[PDB]
Amino acid sequence: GLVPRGSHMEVVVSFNDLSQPFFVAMRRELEDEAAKLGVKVQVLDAQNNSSKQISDLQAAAVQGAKVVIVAPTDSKALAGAADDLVEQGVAVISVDRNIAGGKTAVPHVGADNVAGGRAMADWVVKTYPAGARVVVITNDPGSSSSIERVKGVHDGLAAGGPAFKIVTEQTANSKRDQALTVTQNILTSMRDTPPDVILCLNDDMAMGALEAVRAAGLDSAKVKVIGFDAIPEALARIKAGEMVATVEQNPGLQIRTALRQAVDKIKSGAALKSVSLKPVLITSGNLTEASRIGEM
Numbered sequence: 200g201l202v203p204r205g206s207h208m209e210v211v212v213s214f215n216d217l218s219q220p221f222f223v224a225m226r227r228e229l230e231d232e233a234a235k236l237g238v239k240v241q242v243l244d245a246q247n248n249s250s251k252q253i254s255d256l257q258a259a260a261v262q263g264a265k266v267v268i269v270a271p272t273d274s275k276a277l278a279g280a281a282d283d284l285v286e287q288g289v290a291v292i293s294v295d296r297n298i299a300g301g302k303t304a305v306p307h308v309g310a311d312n313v314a315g316g317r318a319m320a321d322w323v324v325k326t327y328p329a330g331a332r333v334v335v336i337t338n339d340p341g342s343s344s345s346i347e348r349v350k351g352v353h354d355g356l357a358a359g360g361p362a363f364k365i366v367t368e369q370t371a372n373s374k375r376d377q378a379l380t381v382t383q384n385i386l387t388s389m390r391d392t393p394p395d396v397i398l399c400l401n402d403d404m405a406m407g408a409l410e411a412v413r414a415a416g417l418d419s420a421k422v423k424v425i426g427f428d429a430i431p432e433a434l435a436r437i438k439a440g441e442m443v444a445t446v447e448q449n450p451g452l453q454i455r456t457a458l459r460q461a462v463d464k465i466k467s468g469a470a471l472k473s474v475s476l477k478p479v480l481i482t483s484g485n486l487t488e489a490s491r492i493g494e495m
């Protein structure tokens with residue numbers, strides 16, 4: 200869906216799946232920053248298809264793109280395309296999740312997702328000092344963000360010990376509809392001993408898990424749901440006392456930082472560099488620390 204370049208002040212931005220609310224919101228911040236920087240952004244949606252994303256990236260290079268910002272559908276699967284683009288003289292920077300396993304080290308702007316996952320688990324260990332039964336519902340399984348969030352959750356619960364039980368860990372592929380049915384089936388499988396905490400690795404899925412908890416006739420005070428992203432819908436649930444926590448990862452700042460680096464690469468050849476942002480756990484006491492609180 201590319202059009203011809205009119206100047207050098209153009210960047211191609213390839214999103215993994217623009218049907219995800221987190222990324223729709225990220226795209227809005229991208230468009231603001233692009234206007235402010237005087238750069239045209241051409242936005243491509245991979246529609247959760249690695250083959251399409253790879254062909255999109257190849258096409259952008261053929262048509263003259265010199266910097267591409269990519270949120271890869273799968274962090275390992277896009278390594279070949281990134282290497283090819285670099286070899287052709289196209290600079291690549293990743294956003295939100297990384298590209299890994301290739302010849303070239305691709306600079307990456309994202310959240311510290313291990314720290315984010317660890318914050319969720321540390322919350323569980325602090326809140327349940329005698330132990331707890333935990334369900335983990337994971338995001339986009341091929342993404343570094345899922346892999347690293349999961350690792351941080353594992354780290355914190357392993358540190359807590361055998362009293363902190365991961366009763367099941369399943370993906371809902373960053374989809375609210377899958378989150379509902381996946382969570383329902385998990386609840387049914389342990390209806391005689393419901394979990395204490397459902398850790399959901401994005402807020403869209405957390406909304407589905409909250410609904411599954413309600414559909415099961417369970418009490419959101421006894422079966423607690425924690426998300427990730429601090430989207431306004433989740434912030435409202437925390438304000439209402441239905442959801443306990445989420446995690447702020449500053450997606451506006453991620454995308455703005457990637458674009459700022461891209462523009463400096465175009466203007467002066469400045470090197471693209473990795474930046475990891477520290478996430479912050481958001482509860483009812485610090486809702487205003489969420490970057491999108493003004494939308495709630």
Ligand SMILES: O[C@H]1[C@H](O)[C@@H](O)[C@H](O)[C@@H](O)[C@H]1O
Nearest residue numbers: 221338339342344373401428
């Ligand atoms: O950081 C993002 C965010 O959490 C999205 O909501 C999720 O679906 C993606 O998988 C993740 O990489």
